[PDB]
Write a protein that binds this ligand. Structure first.
Ligand SMILES: Nc1ncnc2c1ncn2[C@@H]1O[C@H](COP(=O)(O)OP(=O)(O)OP(=O)(O)O)[C@@H](O)[C@H]1O
Ligand SMILES: Nc1ncnc2c1ncn2[C@@H]1O[C@H](COP(=O)(O)OP(=O)(O)O)[C@@H](O)[C@H]1O
Ligand SMILES: [Mg+2]
Ligand SMILES: [Mg+2]
Lengths: 277, 177, 210, 365, 141, 70, 105, 52, 70, 52
């Protein structure tokens, strides 16, 4: 009757307190994990300066990884890159080739094993519990070069700002399969570089492409972690707004029920007293 | 042969054919990089821009005139307009030069590119300068490394990397002028 | 008998037949609500007596939108056939566009995302909202309202900024020659002979700013 | 026996008995006069007997409008051809004192009961606002010197309402199909006068204020309208299973109404987002344009057969129309018109670039 | 989950059209199905009291109980909505007195007071018109 | 099922049903205290997933038709 | 409150001044009139206030006006019971208020 | 709500009160362990919001 | 502490207490504003941690056993 | 949640104006000068409109 609305008010009030605390928690996490995102942006520059950027390559095998989140109050991030994953994957699979879809974060294994299920071989999680390190991303890249595809698509949300998260695809051509072929311009463009390695160019390109996969995978999950924090900071602001709006309507409903309660109890007392007096 | 012109602007039209018009086109990492390799410039004299990178820290994006890198065929100096190279670095000391002033970082490996537009890029994984490393544990680490040698291939490759890095670090700590 | 109190009063507002003189009486009852509760007793009594409603929202009245007509809730189903034609020619499209304006109402980019293909419905519903704002003690003849909603609906004000549509409306009413007002008032509809001359006189108006 | 009305939500979720009592519960502005006018438009034309409209405490303008529409449509003829008229109007509208509104339903019942008993006919009886009978009895009851019952009504609410409503009965010598609008006083279904009326009816059609505020018309609450005809042994198992599946999807969406509000749809499970999508499709698909609402809405009315309703809601339940958008289901007749509206909704976004319209050298034609 | 006993009062409570009459009816039908299987002393004689219901519902229930055969063991006490307020007030006591014959003669009875909240309403009307002072929701004390 | 109580419990039902319905009364209670966490779906250690995947079977088992007693 | 308003009305009508009239907690005026109405055996209105609530407030508030001789301006402290602005006493007081001065901590 | 958890007897561990819960009467071991049980149960009741 | 008022206030208290409890009520109000953050694991910006430790010790300082006034 | 660092100057002229506006609403009263020392100020209407 009139106690259920008061306990629902007491529910939504500390739900709003919870989400107001969670917004500042995610905001402090976004502020602390911004400098690492700014530092890791440097090392992805020389590899796309050297190897270029060729997303629409015709390959035989491609490992596509979608870097999702771990906990799921982000509010429209892990489904937006699932949409972007299928949108960039239908673009680049019309050669009759095999495609391996991977997800980093266990909110992507819940969203990717029902839309592309039989092409889903690997699921990685818990990468944001302590922090994101380069040895962790190098091990993840080692399980990515367990199989040897001709491309590595990395789907992640680039932390452009605290408001805007542009989803970014990044591609890594494996060396002898696609990289030595996709650089030929009347000869080659890589032949301008004087290889100063121990063994031949076919091995220094192998080391360079594995290191480029590790570098952009580390930067991808770091950018996606910062976008997770900055999207949770906005989703919890929306939850405070909604649980203040719901609380404001439910307060008026409780006031109407309270006024009607005193009126009906008083009318009952007057109707009892008018039968006797 | 260049009969397949892949790229970011060629990806956009195939994405406008096969992916729907509900979503804006995804970004690419070449949209965030203002400096390329073949687009000429950046030298303008005797200096040339350096890019000393670790995965966790940007160590220098200033403009130096001499860069000393520890390549696997030995040390080599990079002056203003070097030949374009891709130099695999061994453990050694990278030395930056601004003139009278110098920065001497000891790196752990990695690569170093010189590009046809005169820019250079040093891509290491851990670059600790020489006051941050102690000379007491490098000899303890080499004595714990070069003595116990497993004949297994993975452990002996790790041991070869250990004795190479610790020997270069021992030869680098007392060779400060 | 508090329902009978208002039904006695409001049933006397009628439109008499031709054998009773043909006269009419139009009632405008005013009911004040508490905190926008229109499900109250006297509110729902007079709603179930009168023909339509004019819901004046308290949220739009403090956002400067005056008169603060709640366009989603306020109906009028008896004077819908008793509408000035010409205003019936444009205002149906006006109400349809304000209906599909309330499909993106206050979640343009406030909630999660913005489309930028439905930026047009937002930056047109804001123009149709600022068109209907009107200062106090200044009622407009209907022939000068249908021309203003004609300029707001046919697209003669989309390049005007939203801050100056209230000045653009009075500039349209001042600069268009007053013959079209007399023709629209006498003919009682925007004729196909009139909309050409109206689009002629609506493309030579000096909309300020922009 | 079923009585098909052409309304999708009525024929699907709470079908009307051919000789049963029907209630249209409503809250002052939700559309129980538009619904009863559409039932007059759809049922009384296909009926073979006589209709008796009892106007109890409603607007006099509505009685004049119904009289002019029934004269124009030919079911009321004037002068010498008056014997071929098929409707009796009995009007005790809200300008009358509470003694007149308390007994005018009895006059309508007497005119209907003569056709049922003596004439042996099958009668239709539409009573607009059977609440006004109860309200008039509560108005006169304060001056008869009675102690009031609960919230302010007469002590004899249930027995007066029972003595009225038990005279409306399909007997062995004639049938009355009674459609009674019931008014809930302040959108309170727990008010004693509609709560007493709920036990007298075979099919309640509870119209809701929130469904009307969503723009859905007729604003029938699907999870509050019931009927005794929704039984698999009387309307067949296919229709019954479709209605129960639609109610299950709507109840599962109503269970998620608080998580979607305070958290958004992005935190729902993948199985529940499909439930929300199918429920937002079926709750636009329950809405329908009316032939009596076309004068103030502009869209033409839609009469929908029963098999089209079952065939449409089968397709939306199984998942055959996850391609089409939610607004393609809104205010359309059948499942064909959903596809023929999703075509027009995607011709129109391709009609952003069709031409630039200009009519030149025209002023001297 | 809610196992009944043979002398136990069990309240079926819910909103309107939530299946309370269905549970009571299926109980009566199951006593018909069990009475043709047990030896003459575990047989259960149902009594259905319809308080305040309309007469079409009671006639439909009589048609159901005759077309399934449950009317051979069932009494139906029917004070409908058209009846007076003391008749609906007194009909659960009439049904209980009719069902106490089987309880007092060694047999086993089943009594369903359908719409006891309508018998309370009839009692409220009957006592308010006797000018007794009202209480909670104008009910008698 | 969380609000429907009876005073007798045992000693008033079928002795065969008494052996079987205790594992029903317990596992529906296991289902009800889990299903208030059905907004996330973390499926903790395949145990909170399993108890709802049995309790949904029990609630679907308990449904039956009308005018057809068993 | 009628006593204080009469002392203000002499300054309004005879002196021809612009007098101020401060009513500390007009809700207590409403509550005292409700208690007087309850002691006189009258049936209470909605939530517990007097049936004469709008007219007992209006008998006070309509004498606070500007005339041709002078003016009475009134600053009334307003208490809101259970922070309900839709309670009948603040909702009936707010129909006479021409301004509002919120003082906050 | 305690009996809806299956816990019997369904005593509210917080809302139950006695005059004997006094360290001068039942002893400072019994009183302190009862206050500690009520403290940890109130802490869990405050955490039951953020758990869900 | 948030719902307890004293309209006479600080004008009728101990002047030794008046200079020290004035900081105390402001610290407790700041602790009440941030009291939702207390049951969080990821530690905050260390300005709210300072008040969340300070007020949580100040609320322990206001505890008192029965029938032993100070 | 962010600080003065991420405020635009378009959203910092509003801060720098609103702070001195909410300072300028304050005013010393004549009836408080017997215990506050500073004298009271009577501000005209035209002076208020000009000064704001
Ligand atoms: N086990 C069941 N399976 C399917 N339908 C059922 C079942 N039980 C009840 N119903 C349906 O629910 C509707 C309401 O049934 P019932 O009359 O038993 O409820 P009620 O509470 O007695 O209604 P009222 O409050 O109007 O008397 C009926 O139309 C019936 O068909
Ligand atoms: N089927 C419908 N289509 C369009 N509008 C409707 C429909 N039903 C109701 N409405 C709107 O709701 C209002 C309901 O008025 P009315 O039919 O008199 O209901 P009530 O008698 O409950 O007040 C009308 O003004 C009408 O604009
Ligand atoms: Mg009506
Ligand atoms: Mg029943």
């Amino acid at each position: 009757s009139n106690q259920a609305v008061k306990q629902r008010i007491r529910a939504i009030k500390n739900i709003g307190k919870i989400t107001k605390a969670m917004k500042m928690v995610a905001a402090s996490k976004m502020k602390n994990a911004q400098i690492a995102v700014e530092q890791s942006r440097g090392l992805v520059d020389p590899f796309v300066r050297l190897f270029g950027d060729f997303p629409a390559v015709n390959s035989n095998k491609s490992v596509v990884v979608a870097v999702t989140s771990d906990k799921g109050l982000c509010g429209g991030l892990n489904s937006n890159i699932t949409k972007y994953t299928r949108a960039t994957l239908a673009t680049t699979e019309s050669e009759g080739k095999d495609v391996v879809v991977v997800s980093i974060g266990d909110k992507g294994r819940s969203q990717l094993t029902r839309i592309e299920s039989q092409r889903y071989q690997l699921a990685i999680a818990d990468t944001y519990k302590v922090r994101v390190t380069f040895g962790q991303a190098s091990l993840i890249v080692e399980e990515l070069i367990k199989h040897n595809p001709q491309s590595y698509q990395i789907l992640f949300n680039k932390f452009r700002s605290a408001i805007s998260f542009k989803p970014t695809v990044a591609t890594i051509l494996s060396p002898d399969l696609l990289e030595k072929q996709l650089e030929d311009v009347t000869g080659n463009s890589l032949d301008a570089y004087d290889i100063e390695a121990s063994h031949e160019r076919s091995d220094v390109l192998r080391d360079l492409t594995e290191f480029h996969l590790g570098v952009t995978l580390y930067n991808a999950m770091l950018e996606n972690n910062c976008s997770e924090h900055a999207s949770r900071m906005s989703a919890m602001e929306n939850s405070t707004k909604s649980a203040g709006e719901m609380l404001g309507k439910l307060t008026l409903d409780y006031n109407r029920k309270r006024q009607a309660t005193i009126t009906t109890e008083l009318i009952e007392i007057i109707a009892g007293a008018s039968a006797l007096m | 042969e260049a009969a397949a012109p892949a790229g970011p602007k060629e990806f956009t039209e195939v994405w406008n054919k096969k992916a729907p018009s509900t979503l804006i086109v995804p970004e690419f990492p070449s949209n965030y990089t203002a400096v390329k390799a073949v687009g000429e410039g950046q030298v303008h004299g005797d200096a040339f821009p350096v890019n000393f990178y670790t995965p966790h820290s940007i160590l220098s994006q200033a403009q130096k005139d001499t860069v000393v890198l520890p390549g696997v065929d030995g040390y080599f100096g990079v002056k203003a307009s070097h030949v374009p190279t891709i130099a695999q670095l061994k453990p050694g000391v990278v030395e930056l030069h601004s003139g009278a002033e110098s920065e001497k970082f000891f790196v752990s490996g990695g690569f170093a590119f010189v590009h046809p537009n005169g820019v250079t890029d040093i891509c290491v994984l851990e670059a600790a300068t020489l006051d941050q490393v102690d000379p007491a544990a490098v000899k303890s680490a080499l004595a714990a490394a070069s003595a116990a040698q497993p004949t297994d291939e993975f452990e002996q490759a790790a041991n070869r990397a250990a004795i190479e890095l610790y020997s270069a670090l021992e030869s680098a700590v007392e060779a400060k002028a | 008998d508090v329902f009978y109190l208002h039904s006695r009063l409001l049933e006397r507002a009628a439109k008499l037949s031709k054998e009773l003189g043909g006269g009419s009486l139009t009632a405008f009852p005013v009911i004040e609500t508490q905190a926008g509760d229109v499900s109250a007793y006297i509110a729902t009594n007079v709603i179930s007596i009168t023909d339509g409603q004019i819901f004046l929202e308290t949220e739009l009245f403090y956002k400067g939108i005056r008169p603060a007509l709640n366009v989603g809730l306020s109906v009028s189903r008896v004077g819908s056939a008793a509408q000035f034609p010409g205003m019936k020619q444009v205002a149906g499209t006006l109400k349809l566009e304000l209906a599909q304006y309330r499909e993106v109402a206050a979640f343009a980019q406030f909630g999660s995302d913005l489309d930028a293909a439905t930026q047009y419905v937002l930056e047109r519903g804001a123009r149709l909202t600022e068109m209907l704002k009107q200062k106090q003690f200044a009622p407009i003849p209907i022939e000068r309202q249908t021309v203003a909603v004609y300029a707001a609906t046919k697209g003669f004000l989309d390049k005007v900024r939203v801050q100056d549509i209230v000045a653009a409306e009075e500039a349209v009413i001042s600069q268009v020659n007053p013959a079209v007002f007399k023709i629209l008032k006498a003919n009682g509809k925007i004729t196909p002979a009139l909309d050409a001359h109206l689009k002629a006189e609506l493309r030579k108006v000096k909309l300020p700013g922009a | 026996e079923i009585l098909v009305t052409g309304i999708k939500v009525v024929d699907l979720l709470a079908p009307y008995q051919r000789g049963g009592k029907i209630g249209l519960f409503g809250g002052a502005g939700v559309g129980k006069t538009v619904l009863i006018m559409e039932l007059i438009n759809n049922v009384a034309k296909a009926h073979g007997g006589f209709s008796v409209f009892a106007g109890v405490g409603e607007r006099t303008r509505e009685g004049n409008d119904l009289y002019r529409e029934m004269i124009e449509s030919g079911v009321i003829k004037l002068g010498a051809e008056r014997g071929n008229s098929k409707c009796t109007l009995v009007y005790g509208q809200m300008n009358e004192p509470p003694g007149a509104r308390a007994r005018v339903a009895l006059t309508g019942l007497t005119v209907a009961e003569y056709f049922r008993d003596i004439e042996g006919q099958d009668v239709l009886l539409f009573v607009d606002n059977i609440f006004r009978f109860t309200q008039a009895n509560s108005e006169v009851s304060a001056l008869l010197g009675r102690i009031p019952s609960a919230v302010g009504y007469q002590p004899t609410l249930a027995t007066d309402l029972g003595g009225l409503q038990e005279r409306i009965t399909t007997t062995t010598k004639g049938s009355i199909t009674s459609v009674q609008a019931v008014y809930v006083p302040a959108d309170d279904l727990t008010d004693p006068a509609p709560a007493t009326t709920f036990a007298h009816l075979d099919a309640t059609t509870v119209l809701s204020r929130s469904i009307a505020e969503l723009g859905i018309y007729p604003a029938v609450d699907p999870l509050d309208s019931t009927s005794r005809m929704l039984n698999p042994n009387v309307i067949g198992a296919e229709h019954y299973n479709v209605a129960r599946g639609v109610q299950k999807v709507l109840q599962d969406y109503k269970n998620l109404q608080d998580i979607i509000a305070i958290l958004g749809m992005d935190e729902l499970s993948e199985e529940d987002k499909l439930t929300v999508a199918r429920a937002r499709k079926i709750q636009r698909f329950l809405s329908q344009p009316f032939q009596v609402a076309e004068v103030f809405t502009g869209t033409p009315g839609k009469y929908v057969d029963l098999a089209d309703t079952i065939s449409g809601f089968q397709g939306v339940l199984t998942g055959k129309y996850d391609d089409l958008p939610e607004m393609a289901f809104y205010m359309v007749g059948d499942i064909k018109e959903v596809k023929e509206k999703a075509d027009k909704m995607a011709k129109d976004i391709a009609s952003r670039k069709e031409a630039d319209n200009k009519k030149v050298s025209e002023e001297l034609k | 989950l809610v196992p009944i006993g043979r002398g136990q009062r069990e309240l079926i409570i819910g909103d309107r059209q939530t299946g309370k009459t269905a549970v009571a009816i299926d109980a009566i039908i199951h006593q018909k199905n069990c009475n043709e299987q047990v030896p003459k002393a575990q047989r259960v004689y149902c009594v259905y009291v319809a308080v305040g219901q309309k007469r079409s519902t009671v006639a439909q229930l009589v048609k159901l109980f005759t077309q399934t055969g449950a009317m051979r063991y069932t009494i139906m006490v029917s004070a409908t909505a058209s009846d007076a307020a003391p008749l609906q007030f007194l009909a659960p006591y009439s049904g209980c007195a009719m069902a106490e014959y089987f309880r007092d003669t060694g047999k086993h009875g089943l009594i369903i007071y359908d719409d006891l909240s309508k018998q309370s309403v009839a009692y409220r009307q009957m006592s308010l018109l006797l000018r007794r002072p009202p209480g909670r929701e104008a009910f008698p004390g």
